[model samples]
Target chain A: QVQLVQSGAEVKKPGASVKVSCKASGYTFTNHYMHWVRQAPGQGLEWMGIINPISGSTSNAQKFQGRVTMTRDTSTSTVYMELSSLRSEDTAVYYCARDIVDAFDFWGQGTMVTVSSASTKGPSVFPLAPSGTAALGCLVKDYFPEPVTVSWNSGALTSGVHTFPAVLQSSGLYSLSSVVTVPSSSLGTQTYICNVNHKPSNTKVDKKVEPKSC
Target chain B: AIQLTQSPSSLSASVGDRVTITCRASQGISSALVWYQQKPGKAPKLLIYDASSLESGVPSRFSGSGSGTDFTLTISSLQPEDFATYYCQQFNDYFTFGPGTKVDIKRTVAAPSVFIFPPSDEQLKSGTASVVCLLNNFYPREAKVQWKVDNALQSGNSQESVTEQDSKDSTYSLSSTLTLSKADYEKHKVYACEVTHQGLSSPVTKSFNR
Candidate 1:
């Protein structure tokens, strides 16, 4: 029965640094490995780094390199991660987990870091369709140089198509998707095509899904 | 995927025994490994890092060597306190640790003596044909007894009785009997009993013939 208890939440301004602590108990303190993970509001979990408590050795993720520091105090059985040069995009709930068998078996409750004062500092920052009277979706992912356009084979078809905004990725890139709803009877024995227009890259591509491809 | 394994899950060592434990990784990691020593109910203490570099304040008797994937941790001479568990960890690509190797004190074991008794003439004539196998005066309870016929396992009408421990010398004994009809008993050429114990490197087998 191992337990990891993390520090409380902290509200830091942009460019400020924050250090979170995770104190462990119920087992030998320095025996097991410790790790840190990040989860932003409404976003998936991401790995931050790992630390060997006994040796005080650490390794950070490629994305967190030069910005995240990991350390531990064996006397107190506490492990810490200090994140520097923080920004608005760094706002998230940081969690400390125990590494058992190469997996996170025990986790801390989580320390939420609110990087407020976004007004003061600078910023950073899926497709499926089916069924009767079906909706055809065109997804564009992992693309750069934004302002992408999506067009169906049917000309002047803006009423039936809804293109979502370009969402920023953790890589500082953007992705956008568009969908079109059409009657199933009209699609019978006919093929529909989607054209993607990227003016910045001087590239235009057409995509189509065959009924057999399903 | 980076995988790791430790050889000799556990071993018996004397105070002066030179003990070596091995840890192997799946790929070349270029000396990004560490070793730790953990005792019962205590946290593991780091002994070596960077594959061969000893941590500050660690004793010279404890040492590590090797690079890339294969590595070894050697105890120059095992001490009383050194009879504990050792583990190896890697930080090259992802994080992983070996299962661990436990070292314990070695003790002397007494080998068992085995014997087989063929059926007596009076019982054979009365059709009560049976062969008895006995293992006597073995130290440590862990042992295996099996009856064999012509170098193969004898599965028909055989029973290995429960082990009996002698209170005087704290030794164990057990017996097995192979019962067969008079017609079937004379048909088999070789009836054997094999006794396996930790003290012996190989099985001790005794054979009996009518």
Candidate 2:
């Protein structure tokens, strides 16, 4: 009759945070340790860590040391996991289980956290004009499904055009930044553009910068 | 840290079939071991610990027995949900997990292991006594790490480095550093490093005095 029921699925964007709750019933929640695990889409299971509800003592996986925080409320028979600095890597289904003796025998239904928040989503481009230098940069965010391409307009934004790798953000989505070197003399006088092609959304987000006359 | 190695890395079966798996430690780890089961795309659930102690609520069909470097985990009869990977972990010195015996894992995988560099050399010079827990041989390029001062669990109090996976195998290596003052660890001489994974019920510790 012991049961651990978890929260529902989520959708979030990069840099956001989310808290997933696991409620325990038909058992003494404090007498046993509560542990959490994660499963990314198509990936293997990974142990997040465990907590002792009685003593407030805790241990975690190194990678999740500060990023994934697990705490329990004895009054409510619930365990909570708060994932901060959400990234696409944080996009996964999470489950909570009761530590019986040494192994876990009772488990909660998995709660998915696309960075623990299914409310936000991305791959858009942002243009940052330079103040310290003649060069400019573009920011792209909120795209899902791994494979993405970031580039700049060849005719309008060329020369020293560099695209950084797509990084999974804490928002449970992907992001990337691009930089362009427009000659100091031509600064803001010409248009600079950033182009983002996302396959999963099958849509493109193009962020552009126009000439700024000082 | 004692290491665990399991066999039949994978298997196939249907409901009502009995299944068996084995895990061997790197050294004599005695009966201080735990067993875990994991379904694909999820986390591992503990099935047994302290060698043969079956977790409550677990069916009687699943059992374990062994001591020293040898151990066994058996399912008297398999249920549909029982089809999953299994592994063993030891806590003799510090918590260490085996390369799970699996049906298969497609993500970055590695049998995460831990060891210490000890408190000497630079460790002895700095009043900033430091313990470095090396998390090695894990893949998709990540591993969770933790520390215990005797029995007190500490997190924000420690610092860790960027983890990098190998090109040859895609496995990675990282280190967790818990600095409580060199004199502090030497004063108590009891510290441990815990990896975030099952079979790892607790942290693997090293008495600084050792």
How good is the docking of model 1, by CAPRI class? incorrect
Over the stretch B1-210, how does candidate 1's per-residue lDDT look in tens digits? 777889888676779889999999888878888787766333455688788888767788999998988999999998888977887878545556777887766656878766566655445676646576655556665678788877778775765543324434545555565667799888888888888898889998888654
Candidate 1: the clashing residue pairs are none
Q: How many pairs of residues collide in model 1?
A: 0
For candidate 1, write residues A1-214 as lDDT tens digits. Answer: 6677889878776799999999999998877889887766434355688889889888887888999999999888999999999987898889887775333546777888867552221111022323245555554544554457777774556545545555444434454555565767766665666777776566676766333232
- Highest-lDDT candidate: 1
lDDT of 1 at B65: 97
lDDT score of residue A191 within candidate 1: 63
Residue-by-residue lDDT tens digits, candidate 2, B138-209:
543334676777667886666554332333454445555565656666667557776764334554543344
TM-score of model number 1, chain B: 0.55
RMSD of each candidate? 29.7, 17.1
